[PDB]
Amino acid sequence: VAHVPDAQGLVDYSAQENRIWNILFERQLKLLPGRACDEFLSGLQTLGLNSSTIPQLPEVSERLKAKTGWQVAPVAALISAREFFELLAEKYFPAATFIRSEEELDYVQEPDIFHELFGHCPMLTDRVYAEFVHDYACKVLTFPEQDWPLLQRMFWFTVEFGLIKTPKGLRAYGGGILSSISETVYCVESDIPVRILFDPVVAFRMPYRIDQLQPVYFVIDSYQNLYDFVLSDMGKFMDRARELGELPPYFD
């Protein structure tokens, strides 16, 4: 459960909440160097993220906005799929104003202010990415609830768990990877996962499990790949994905 912010956006966190931010921050920072994409590296710097206190949203927002028109909006712990996408649509990234507990450090299903401000926001400082996230949200109206599961599949294999094969090698952009210490090493160093060439139809055909280290990642060679995809008519990729069948899981 979350804090409710004051007249002017500020939120009264105390020491313990701050230490956990700190332990989370300190340990992810170490692993980033050969693993996160350059754009993530600099987004973090651009966003002013201290390894010491939980940020105040106004300042973070102000910084995001000046890079790409995005902002951060404070919300409660359990917002709905619709509320998430309605916010992304108006260029606001939702930030729940609580942090995971000491006991819930390593794995955590309910996304907190670390998951958000550390894992996701920093990639929203890259212009083509920020524009793809926004267009993507927007187009998820236009679509009926019957199609959001496939749209939420695609989101999982890009915004959350996507990799980018760069000239200096494989890196990760996914905010679900970059906020977890386990994923961040595994995603680009293990011989277990299958890494597939990002293609819209095949991501739509790929099933997934939330709580588990991902057995399949999709690889992009430029954020422009995600941009062309959503400036092209989804709908058509989605049907097609349905006429060929859902693939069999690699997990169980």
Numbering used by the authors: 8 to 259
Sentences from the paper on this structure:
PAH is the enzyme that catalyzes the hydroxylation of l-phenylalanine (l-Phe) to l-tyrosine (l-Tyr) using non-heme Fe(II) and tetrahydrobiopterin (BH4) as cofactors, and dioxygen as additional substrate. In mammals, PAH has a major catabolic role and its dysfunction is associated to deleterious hyperphenylalaninemia and phenylketonuria, whereas as we have recently shown L. pneumophila PAH (lpPAH) has an important role in the growth of the bacterium in media deficient in l-Tyr and in the synthesis of a brownish pigment called pyomelanin. Similarly to all other PAHs, the activity of lpPAH is totally dependent upon a non-heme ferrous ion, but – in contrast to all other studied PAHs which are iron-bound tetramers (eukaryotes) or monomers (bacteria) – lpPAH is isolated as an iron-free (apo) homodimer when expressed recombinantly. Molecular and enzyme kinetic characterization has shown that lpPAH is well suited for catalysis at human body temperature, revealing a maximum activity around 40 °C and very high specific activity compared to other eukaryote and prokaryote PAHs.
The best crystal diffracted to 2.5 Å and in the observed electron density maps the dimeric lpPAH structure is clearly defined, in particular for chains A and B. Thus, the current model gives good insight into the lpPAH structure. The catalytic domain of other non-heme iron- and BH4-dependent aromatic amino acid hydroxylases (AAAHs) has a mixed α/β fold, also found for the reported lpPAH structure. In agreement with the dimeric nature of lpPAH in solution there are two dimers in the asymmetric unit, formed by either chains A and D or chains B and C. Here there are strong ionic interactions (<4 Å) involving Asp198A-Arg247D, Asp228A-Lys172D, Arg247A-Asp198D and Lys172A-Asp228D. In addition to the ionic interactions, which appear to seal the lpPAH dimer together, the interacting interface is composed of the β-strands Val201-Arg202-Ile203-Leu204-Phe205 and Val223-Tyr224-Phe225-Val226-Ile227 from each subunit, and the adjacent hydrophobic C-terminal coils (Glu251-Asp259) where the two Tyr257 residues establish an important stacking interaction. In lpPAH (chain A) a water molecule is found at the similar position as Fe(II) in other PAHs in the metal-bound holo-form. From the observed electron density it is clearly a solvent molecule and not a metal ion, in agreement with lpPAH being isolated as an apoenzyme. One striking feature in lpPAH is an extended aromatic cluster protruding from the conserved active site residues Phe91, Phe92 (Leu in hPAH), Phe100, Phe139 (Tyr in cp, cv, hPAH) and Phe162. In lpPAH the cluster is extended by residues Tyr143 (Tyr in cp, cvPAH), Phe205 (Phe in cp, cvPAH), Phe211, Phe236 and Phe244, and enclosed by Pro207.
